[PDB]
Design a protein around this ligand. Structure first.
Ligand SMILES: CC1(C)C[C@@](C)(c2cc(Cl)c(O)cc2O)Oc2cc(O)c(Cl)cc21
Ligand SMILES: O=C(O)CCC(=O)C(=O)O
Ligand SMILES: [Fe+2]
Length: 432
């Protein structure tokens, strides 16, 4: 028999107390009516503007459209990878259309509240037994807003292990967050035996384990729960659907290191340091052909192409919908990437040079081969996603573009989109 515990069960309380002291529930009544009102109409304002989208992700070779629709809000220039998809933040105001702007400021306000609340709970957790690590682990820099109308799903998956009923989101961890960082969730739903099917819950279980009954926490309008310290790492959680639509705001400390606009612009500039930068034209000449430098260049070339450009454009107009913040950055990154395409072309030219000693030539190939191989394989992978049957089902404002894509016989680009011949020839030379 698959069982779980809820507040109806005598044992729930001791189970929570003893086995989940890093899980906190602050009920709606602990949060002012003022914040509740401001936050709930911010959700509606964003929903009404169509700012939340389902994502067409890629998982285990499978293109899947997420049941839940979402928008990422947070520090300007920050991003968050979620199921191999890089989400780009709609900026909130610290250091557009008035309404959407206002909403973002609201979610920042909520962020401030939750943050303080989290530090407090971390400090009490510490009192049950530096301060820098506490503030570091509650410094939320993004929220991922989620929405689902359980009515639009024709059939929801049964919870596999504990008989928890229908799932909106099955078991997982929140990934790519700062080590041991808290996660804080504001939950907003409208309105014998086991959990009430009509009510939203969050479910928790320990990783690896389906023998300890899972916990299902009911979540009524405006309840907040917090996952503290290592909880998110040691436990899985899921979201159990009720009968009515529900939003949530999930505040996180995203690991914002190789995932910011400042970082990737810096990487680009680093690559371009190998380029004679007098004038911007098709005559790209390189300062050095030292293995280590050419490798770095080609790696950055792949980084901006696949982690940034292709991720951003995969979503169609999913970002210009509610902000134009990323317009100039993406135009600038693409112009940066286009120069780097000139860089690969010049490298290929150097390699082909008849005066080049074979030893130096081979040392260059060994430097760049893995990068160009990855670039080939990754392109094939991306082009396929853009052409999948599920991708073509999407609406016009969402349908994936495979930007940047060029047909060949497009004299504007120095190299072909399809690198298989070039790769095969490079690899063939190194076997001479
Ligand atoms: C991958 C899988 C099947 C499992 C699960 C539980 C999931 C979510 C997240 Cl966020 C995670 O980091 C890891 C996970 O296993 O939930 C979703 C939700 C979705 O919308 C889609 Cl398309 C796929 C999935
Ligand atoms: O909505 C919640 O309570 C958790 C968030 C979540 O599971 C998600 O959509 O990633
Ligand atoms: Fe989650």
């Amino acid at each position: 028999l698959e069982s779980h515990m809820t507040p109806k069960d005598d044992e729930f309380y001791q189970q929570w107390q003893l086995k989940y002291p890093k899980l906190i529930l602050r009920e709606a009544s602990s949060v002012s009516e003022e914040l509740h009102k401001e936050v709930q109409e911010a959700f509606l304002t964003l929903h009404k503007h169509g700012c939340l989208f389902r994502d067409l992700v890629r998982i285990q070779g499978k293109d899947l459209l997420t049941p839940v629709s979402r928008i990422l809000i947070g520090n300007p220039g920050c991003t968050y990878k979620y199921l191999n998809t890089r989400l780009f933040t709609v900026p909130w105001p610290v250091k557009t259309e008035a309404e959407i702007a206002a909403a973002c400021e609201t979610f920042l306000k909520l962020n401030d509240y939750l943050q303080i609340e989290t530090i407090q709970a971390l400090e009490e957790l510490a009192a049950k037994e530096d301060e820098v690590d506490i503030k570091s682990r509650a410094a939320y820099n993004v929220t991922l807003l989620n929405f689902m109308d359980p009515q639009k799903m024709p059939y929801l998956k049964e919870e596999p292990y504990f008989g928890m009923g229908k799932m909106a989101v099955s078991w997982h961890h929140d990934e790519n967050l700062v080590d041991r960082s808290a996660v804080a969730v504001y939950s907003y739903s409208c309105e014998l035996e086991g959990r009430d099917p009509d009510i939203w819950h969050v479910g928790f279980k320990i990783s690896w384990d389906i023998e300890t009954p899972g916990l299902a926490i009911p979540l009524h309008q405006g309840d907040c729960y917090f996952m503290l310290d290592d909880l998110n790492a040691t436990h899985q959680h899921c979201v159990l659907a009720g009968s009515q639509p529900r939003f949530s705001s999930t505040h996180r400390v995203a690991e914002c290191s190789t995932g910011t606009l400042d970082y990737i612009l810096q990487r680009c500039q680093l690559a371009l340091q190998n380029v004679c930068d007098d004038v911007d034209n098709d005559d790209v000449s390189l300062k050095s052909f030292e293995p280590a430098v050419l490798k770095q260049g080609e790696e950055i070339h792949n980084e901006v192409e696949f982690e940034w450009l292709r991720q951003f454009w995969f979503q169609g107009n999913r970002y210009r919908k509610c902000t134009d913040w990323w317009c100039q950055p993406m135009a600038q990154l693409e112009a940066l990437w286009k120069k780097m395409e000139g860089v690969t072309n010049a490298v290929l030219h150097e390699v082909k040079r008849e005066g080049l000693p074979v030893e130096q030539r081979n040392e260059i190939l060994t430097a760049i081969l893995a990068s160009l191989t990855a670039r080939q394989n990754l392109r094939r992978e991306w082009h396929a996603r853009c052409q999948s049957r599920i991708a073509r089902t999407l609406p016009a404002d969402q349908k994936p573009e495979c930007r940047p894509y060029w047909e060949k016989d497009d004299a504007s680009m120095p190299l072909p989109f399809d690198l298989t011949d070039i790769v095969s020839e490079l690899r063939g030379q190194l076997l001479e």
